[PDB]
Amino acid sequence: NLKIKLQKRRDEVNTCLCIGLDPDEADIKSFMQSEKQNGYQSVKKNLSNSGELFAPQMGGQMLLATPPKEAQEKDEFFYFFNHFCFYIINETKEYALAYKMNFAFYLPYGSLGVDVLKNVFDYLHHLNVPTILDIKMNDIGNTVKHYRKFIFDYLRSDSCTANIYMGTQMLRDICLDEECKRYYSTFVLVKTTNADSHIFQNRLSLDGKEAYVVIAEEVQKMAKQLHLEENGEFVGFVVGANCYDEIKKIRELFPDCYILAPGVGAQKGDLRKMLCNGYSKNYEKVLINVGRAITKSGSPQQAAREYHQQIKEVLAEL
Amino acid sequence: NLKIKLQKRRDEVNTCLCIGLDPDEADIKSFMQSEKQNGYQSVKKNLSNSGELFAPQMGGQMLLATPPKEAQEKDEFFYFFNHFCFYIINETKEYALAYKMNFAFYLPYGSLGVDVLKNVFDYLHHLNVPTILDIKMNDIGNTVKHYRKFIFDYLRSDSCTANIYMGTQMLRDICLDEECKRYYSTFVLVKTTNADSHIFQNRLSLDGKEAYVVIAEEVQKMAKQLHLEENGEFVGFVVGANCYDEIKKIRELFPDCYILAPGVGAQKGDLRKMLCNGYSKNYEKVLINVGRAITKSGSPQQAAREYHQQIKEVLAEL
């Protein structure tokens, strides 16, 4: 159960930093270039530092090797995609409460990237680090059951994100299995980081309440009807790191809620302002996601350490 | 460009029936059982009737063969998943304006199902039948670019579905490539078929207008700013087949809009009532999606022919 897992992890790493692992083609190609030049230094670390060492299920023999030849363009790309991901994990895991992998990044190459994603989730499962698939899933119940199988049975993710524009009944098919015997956590989109996010989230309303509030309220009504919390799980909220007024409102209305807050770093969200406004003494309840500001930095480990330090200093103020 | 493609196809098949291809585990297993017993009758048709015959890129040699042995459980499953999909297509293509494949169904088995999905889209591309990926995509622009690559470059889909809870700016990154030189169509969720769909879509409002209307209006404002229609493309709307009041309102507000209307068949939507309310003389502008009522019927070809007939009779009334 996730609530205990997050609490245990929080005490181990003393942070609420969530590392975003969203690799793009340039990331992979660049890592490949630098590894070819430095003689595969980061892959060597991946192979020794995976502790009980990890055995990838998808292309394990080739990943655990010398690298594929340049003539094998697909295999080479798969090798360097997997090892890029493992490199980020190994460079940053000491500083991470969780990892969030955005599904979109693992799709442009067809099934190749899904095998990578499987190896990533399997590695995180090996390390027992909390995991989130940013899939923003939304559909009718029958279809949602199939998303559930992929996210929770196949990837064995700890949580995912969901978009509830359709209604809250969909939560019944993502947060519970068929038999009503296994329970899963999700984070519902409430306020997003994009510039025009107010157009529906704030401008629409009911009975004096902005849409994002109505969405949050209805979500927790459903979470209570599903008995998630008695079964060690929760429905959390995605609230953008640049959404200062909203994160304050959400923490006020739902003191015990779990918030996932992307937007610090590449998107210029004010970490200190958001963490202050969103603060919970139980600080696993504000996951501060940082992707590109770590994965595209000269030194992912140093970047992660820096955010870890900032968050520590801000938590101390609070 | 899609608008001409749909018009041409409409004149060829004289219908607006959109076949949903959402195979579940029971569908695949059942097809496998019956093929083993009838001596692979449907696969034989798949192999001869694919015209210039189709050559699958993913596992083509094994798919074009005798079937895999039962000991090879994964290969067997892939073989029967692909051939189930090809069977539905071959049994129904004479009656289909388009096919809509819901992404969720192609995920529970990991990368295996994505290879199947690639072969499905590639076959439809071979046949030049209009295609829709029901992915309900929603994210920030940077991430949306990666969904675009998968949907439009990799799968070469004609269109997809999108959820615009985040805002309409996201349309810029799904409907246009980076260079602003290729244009793509999408259908935005407006009104959905699930029982509690009114909770946000109708109960939220702005200035007397229900949410689904505000969403539609803002969508078309953005579609016009993107110049899709001058480039042969459109942003359409998903409006449930059981959403009679809303489909009427949407057709009234946007006489020239393209509607995708799921819900007939398994979900009990009233085809005649919806088609009447949503009617356009340009009848490719109401795609009536029917999935399970065809794919789980004793005879997909007969089921498709029946819907084809009903739609013809209703269009004649109108």
Ligand SMILES: O=c1ccn([C@@H]2O[C@H](COP(=O)(O)O)[C@@H](O)[C@H]2O)c(=O)[nH]1
């Ligand atoms: O409102 C939201 C919801 C989700 N994300 C996701 O969070 C991550 C932000 O990554 P980065 O900007 O830190 O690289 C990406 O996966 C993005 O899709 C946002 O940025 N904003």
Ligand SMILES: O=c1ccn([C@@H]2O[C@H](COP(=O)(O)O)[C@@H](O)[C@H]2O)c(=O)[nH]1
């Ligand atoms: O409001 C919506 C939006 C999408 N779909 C999708 O349309 C298809 C309906 O299939 P069926 O009920 O005809 O089998 C499924 O892919 C489902 O996910 C709906 O049913 N309703």
